[PDB]
UniProtKB/Swiss-Prot annotation:
Domain of life: Eukaryota
Tissue specificity note: Liver and hepatocyte-related cells express mainly FXRalpha1-type isoforms with isoform 3 and isoform 4 in approximately equal proportions. In intestine and kidney mainly FXRalpha2-type isoforms are expressed with isoform 1 and isoform 2 in approximately equal proportions. Expressed in pancreatic beta cells and macrophages.
Effect of residue 32 to R: Abrogates SUMO1-mediated inhibition of ligand-induced transcactivation at ABCB11/BSEP and NR0B2/SHP promoters
Record's subcellular location: Nucleus
Gene designation: NR1H4
Recorded GO CC terms: chromatin; cytosol; euchromatin; nuclear speck; nucleoplasm; nucleus; receptor complex; RNA polymerase II transcription regulator complex
Phenotype upon changing residue 198 to S: As a heterodimer with RXRA, impaired transcriptional activity
Note: Ursodeoxycholic acid (UDCA), a natural agonist of FXR, is approved to treat primary biliary cirrhosis. However, effects are discussed controversial. UDCA is also used to dissolve (cholesterol) gallstones as alternative to surgery.
Main localization, broad class: nucleus
Keyword Metal-binding: yes
Organism of this sequence: Homo sapiens
Protein name: Bile acid receptor
Protein purpose: Ligand-activated transcription factor. Receptor for bile acids (BAs) such as chenodeoxycholic acid (CDCA), lithocholic acid, deoxycholic acid (DCA) and allocholic acid (ACA). Plays a essential role in BA homeostasis through the regulation of genes involved in BA synthesis, conjugation and enterohepatic circulation. Also regulates lipid and glucose homeostasis and is involved innate immune response.
Length: 248
């Protein structure tokens, strides 16, 4: 059972996590669009861009996130985007889409000019995440914990970040007791898939280097948050788009 303050915190998180969905225009493209590598790749690009917009809105409302330095805010956004995208896509693929949407979406991902050395880890992770059979609250807390990670590059005040991250980890452990009482190692399997999740930072960096992927013009938002051509760092002047979205 949760403390009053853990319950307040959990309700803040859930209210922000739920204000976030995939737009019907994007969902309909999975059926509507022609089936070619170029059009499949552009659907994935539109999903990634929407993922990032949603991630930014969620991030802004994490309790205490607004009390960090603007440059550290940028550094948490940049550092967590890839992991938060793969965690959210796993939720979508396992829990939100009808089975027909999920089957077709997978076919389009497998036929978008991305090499199979990046695809199969993605889907192996999706299956490994799905067998844990997580509730919405576990996805929401795990995403908050990924975002408020005191280990990202360019954070000036890591103690401020760890102090926000520590109460979310307590809540998560209790939630695993409450919703998975049969399995007392559930919490450890969750954090174990955090380890698998971080491997996608390197997979993704490799993917952006691929010659297929560079035959392509990313969206404004993806170029900024993934440093596609940009410079790396968290300087305020170097991320006007992110600052704009952060300031609402
Ligand atoms: N966004 C989403 C929602 C549901 C499901 Cl089943 C899968 C996904 N993707 C998995 C994560 N992704 C990517 O890594 C991408 C990585 C690079 C740059 C973008 C275009 C593609 C090449 C695929 C984003 C987007 C598609």
């Amino acid at each position: 059972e949760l403390t009053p303050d853990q319950q307040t915190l959990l309700h803040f998180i859930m209210d922000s996590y739920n204000k976030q969905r995939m737009p019907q225009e994007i969902t309909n493209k999975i059926l509507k669009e022609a089936f070619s590598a170029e059009e499949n790749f552009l659907i994935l690009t539109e999903m990634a861009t929407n993922h990032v917009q949603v991630l930014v809105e969620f991030t802004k409302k994490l309790p205490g996130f607004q009390t960090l330095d603007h440059e550290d805010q940028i550094a948490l956004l940049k550092g967590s985007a890839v992991e938060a995208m793969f965690l959210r896509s796993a939720e979508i693929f396992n829990k939100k889409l009808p089975s027909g949407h999920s089957d077709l979406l997978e076919a389009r991902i497998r036929n978008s000019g991305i090499s199979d050395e990046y695809i199969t880890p993605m889907f192996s992770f999706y299956k490994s995440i799905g067998e844990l059979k997580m509730t919405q609250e576990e996805y929401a807390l795990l995403t908050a914990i990924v975002i408020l990670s005191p280990d990202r590059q360019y954070i000036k005040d890591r103690e401020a970040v760890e102090k926000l991250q520590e109460p979310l980890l307590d809540v998560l452990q209790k939630l695993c007791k409450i919703h998975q009482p049969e399995n007392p190692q559930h919490f450890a399997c969750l954090l174990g898939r955090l380890t698998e999740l971080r491997t996608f930072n390197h997979h993704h960096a490799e993917m952006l280097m691929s010659w297929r992927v560079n035959d392509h013009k990313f969206t404004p938002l993806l170029c900024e948050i993934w440093d596609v051509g940009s410079g790396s760092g968290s300087g305020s002047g170097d991320h006007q788009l992110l600052r704009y979205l952060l300031d609402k």
